[PDB]
Structure 1
């Protein structure tokens, strides 16, 4: 397929991975009686292992010669669920955490004792900030263009050189 890779649903090495993983569990299950708790624990692990291999095969992942799934991350849309969408999901959470943390440090500067607000957090106000993070892309860009994100270079302490 892409980069000489094979879809995991027709990879023979993927098929042997699934079989070897189950033979390894079945020989541990061969040492226990049917209704025992170790037998049910291993029978649930054989169900989980088979389910995972079935899902990967039908997902559009590509396997290598080694029979393991490989991720395509060049930007193509047929493979966006491996990096681009998990990445879009990450950056939304990361910017949320950043926007919310930034909003609280600016609040704490206007406090009676600014450093006491950072070791003893005003939890009702800090929870007010965490809820605000859901629209951080719009809130932060408007913050930028309204001249409130970036401070000018001449209000920042620098080393003499």
Structure 2
């Protein structure tokens, strides 16, 4: 569906479950049970099995080479593969993009602003930090207040 087959029921994807643990069990049969290198392999056996049960219940969409694939055609059924990772990404990318701008206005209204960019005012840098989970309803208000963008006849230009 949506092109290729789901990997919830895929023989090549289930073969990649098979020969990987068959490769990894061949390392297990040269040790003895009870040693700490034995427990390091058998714990690494189950984290590959549960990984292969994570992608089965996740509903990833791939076939013909036994891999998982991802769909970025804006699909709301496939929103867990790209969209809500990006929606948490673009959330507090916009922290650091906004509080770096918020830090760089109160530092300009100082005595010596050149030293203060590498010698931090940590009560002001943390003082402008935690107003960053609520950026874009204030940044859009900043966009329509007017002073987010200076006028073109006062910028540095060639």
Q: Matched residues in 1 for 2:76 and 2:142: separation?
A: 32
Show structure 2 runs of 5+ residues with no match: none
Aligned equivalents of 1:75, 1:85: Cα separation in 2: 11
Runs of 4+ off more than 6 Å: none
Measured after TM superposition, the shift of residue 64 of structure 1 is 2.5
Residue 78 of structure 1 aligns to a residue whose secondary structure is: coil
Confirm or deny that 1:39 pairs with 2:25: no
In structure 2, the residue corresponding to 1:76 is in which secondary structure?
coil
SS of the residue corresponding to residue 104 of structure 2 reads helix
Query: What is the count of residue pairs matched by the alignment?
Result: 158
Structure 2 distance, partners of 1:2, 1:90, is 26
2:91 counterpart residue number: 92
> 1:65-84, aligned counterparts within 5 Å?
65-84=64-83
When you count helix as a share of all residues, which structure comes out higher? 1
- Give distance in 1, aligned partners of 2:138 and 2:66: 46
Distance in 1 separating the partners of 2:127 and 2:66: 49
Match of 2:21 in 1: 22
Hey, what's the Cα distance between the residues in 2 that align with 1:115 and 1:18? Answer: 58
| In 1, Cα distance between equivalents of 2:131 and 2:102 | 9
CA–CA distance in structure 1, aligned partners of residues 5 and 101 of structure 2? 46
Secondary structure, aligned partner of 2:92? helix
Match in the other structure for 1:8 = 7
CA contact (8 A) 1:7 1:63 kept: yes
| TM-score (norm. length: structure 2) | 0.97
Task: Please give the alpha-carbon distance, in whole angstroms, between the structure 1 residues aligned to 2:71 and 2:129.
Answer: 34
Q: TM-score, with normalisation over the residues of structure 1?
A: 0.95
* Other-structure match for 1:145: 144
Mapped to 2, the partners of 1:10 and 1:68 lie a distance apart of 12
Contact 1:143 1:149 in 2 (8 A): yes
Alignment deviations for residues 73-131 of structure 1 (CA, whole Å, 9 cap, x no partner)? 11011001111111111000111110011100111101111111101010111012110
Q: 1:29-82 deviations in whole A, cap 9, x for unaligned? A: 011000011110000000000000101011110113111111001101100111
> How well do the aligned residues superpose, as a CA RMSD in angstroms?
0.8
